[PDB]
Amino acid sequence: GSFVEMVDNLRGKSGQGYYVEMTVGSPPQTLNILVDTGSSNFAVGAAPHPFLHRYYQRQLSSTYRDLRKGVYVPYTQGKWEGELGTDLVSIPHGPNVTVRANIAAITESDKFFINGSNWEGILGLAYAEIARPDDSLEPFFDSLVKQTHVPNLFSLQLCGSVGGSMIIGGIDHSLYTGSLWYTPIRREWYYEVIIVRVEINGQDLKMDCKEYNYDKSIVDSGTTNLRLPKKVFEAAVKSIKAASSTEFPDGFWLGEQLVCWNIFPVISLYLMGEVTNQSFRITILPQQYLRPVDCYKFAISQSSTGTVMGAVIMEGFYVVFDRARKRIGFAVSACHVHDEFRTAAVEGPFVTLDMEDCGYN
Numbered sequence: 001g002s003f004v005e006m007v008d009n010l011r012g013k014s015g016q017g018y019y020v021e022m023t024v025g026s027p028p029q030t031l032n033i034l035v036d037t038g039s040s041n042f043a044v045g046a047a048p049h050p051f052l053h054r055y056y057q058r059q060l061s062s063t064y065r066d067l068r069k070g071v072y073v074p075y076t077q078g079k080w081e082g083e084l085g086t087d088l089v090s091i092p093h094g095p096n097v098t099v100r101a102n103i104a105a106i107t108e109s110d111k112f113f114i115n116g117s118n119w120e121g122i123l124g125l126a127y128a129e130i131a132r133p134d135d136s137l138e139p140f141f142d143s144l145v146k147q148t149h150v151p152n153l154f155s156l157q158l159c160g161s162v163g164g165s166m167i168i169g170g171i172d173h174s175l176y177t178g179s180l181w182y183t184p185i186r187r188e189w190y191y192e193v194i195i196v197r198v199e200i201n202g203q204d205l206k207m208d209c210k211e212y213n214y215d216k217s218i219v220d221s222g223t224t225n226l227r228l229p230k231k232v233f234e235a236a237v238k239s240i241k242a243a244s245s246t247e248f249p250d251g252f253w254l255g256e257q258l259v260c261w262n263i264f265p266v267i268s269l270y271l272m273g274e275v276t277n278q279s280f281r282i283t284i285l286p287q288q289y290l291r292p293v294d295c296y297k298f299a300i301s302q303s304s305t306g307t308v309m310g311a312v313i314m315e316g317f318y319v320v321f322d323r324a325r326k327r328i329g330f331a332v333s334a335c336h337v338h339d340e341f342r343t344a345a346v347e348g349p350f351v352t353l354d355m356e357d358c359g360y361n
């Protein structure tokens with residue numbers, strides 16, 4: 001219910017994701033590690049790349065064990081690759097435990113480390129199914145729960161240098177107001193969920209809900225934007241365009257250029273609820289989808305791999321990754337940025353029929 005040592009354990013830079021301090025090896029080596037609910041590998045710099053403040057030096061760790069296996073991870077502009085092993089890992093501002101975890105020692109990369117960033121690795125918090133090389137490489141959180149008494153859940157309050165909290169093993173009730181509302185984790189690979197309805201300023205998009213989840217919807221701390229399937233993004237922008245016709249170029253809506261609150265509509269996503277024919281809705285503000293760069297980028301964008309509820313969504317809410325119950329809880333975040341008129345919201349219950357049809361097969 002209360003985990004004060006873990007509050008404010010996240011830092012970062014806008015558009016660059018949130019990191020937690022971790023230690024690896026014996027004696028402990030401190031690194032800053034990006035928190036990513038959209039992947040499942042724990043991977044750290046292990047060589048003196050010129051952008052790195054520091055890196056894992058396996059030769060200094062008495063507890064290091066080599067797995068003698070490579071791992072190669074290309075993603076979308078572009079890549080990291082490394083050497084697998086295990087070692088002792090802890091989170092100084094997390095639970096008072098140390099575990100033996102898989103660690104990919106990064107030995108080559110492309111467009112991975114960021115010039116001027118203050119992080120040296122990534123913590124994939126999603127499930128084994130999407131671990132590389134394959135699902136037999138146990139993810140860090142799986143190892144943590146297996147080797148300790150840490151409950152099988154964590155929660156995130158991303159506040160928007162930005163700050164936030166990762167509560168490992170529980171929920172901190174001071175981080176949210178009102179009630180938590182839960183949506184099922186559809187399948188344990190990404191943190192996959194089902195959107196059953198979309199409103200802009202209360203106006204339904206009238207789209208076949210199946211489109212909202214084409215070909216999936218995921219909750220992803222490792223993505224800045226709210227990302228939507230093109231068909232959905234088209235209707236979204238058309239509506240976001242109309243709502244704000246009162247006062248911007250076409251390239252803006254495409255993230256091709258920048259522009260320098262009440263004119264802009266709220267966005268509600270209704271999520272599948274816990275009960276048959278029952279849903280709830282989460283509502284965000286322009287302050288969430290208009291992120292400082294007073295020049296802002298439009299932080300809603302299009303996708304070929306489905307809806308991605310990135311930091312734009314998550315900074316509105318306290319998000320509970322209730323792995324034990326295969327569900328994700330949303331509540332209004334106690335730190336979310338609002339004005340005096342409108343506030344981010346989590347509301348229910350609503351009656352929504354045929355919600356099962358919204359999931360793509």
Ligand SMILES: COc1cccc(-c2cccc([C@@H]3C[C@@H]3c3cc(=O)n(C)c(N)n3)c2)c1
Nearest residue numbers: 015016017034035036038039075221222223
């Ligand atoms: C933008 O902020 C963040 C926050 C946390 C992690 C990352 C991040 C940056 C570059 C690479 C990666 C790893 C390839 C994994 C990855 C790829 C990827 O495309 N996404 C969307 C996510 N969430 N993770 C992760 C980026």
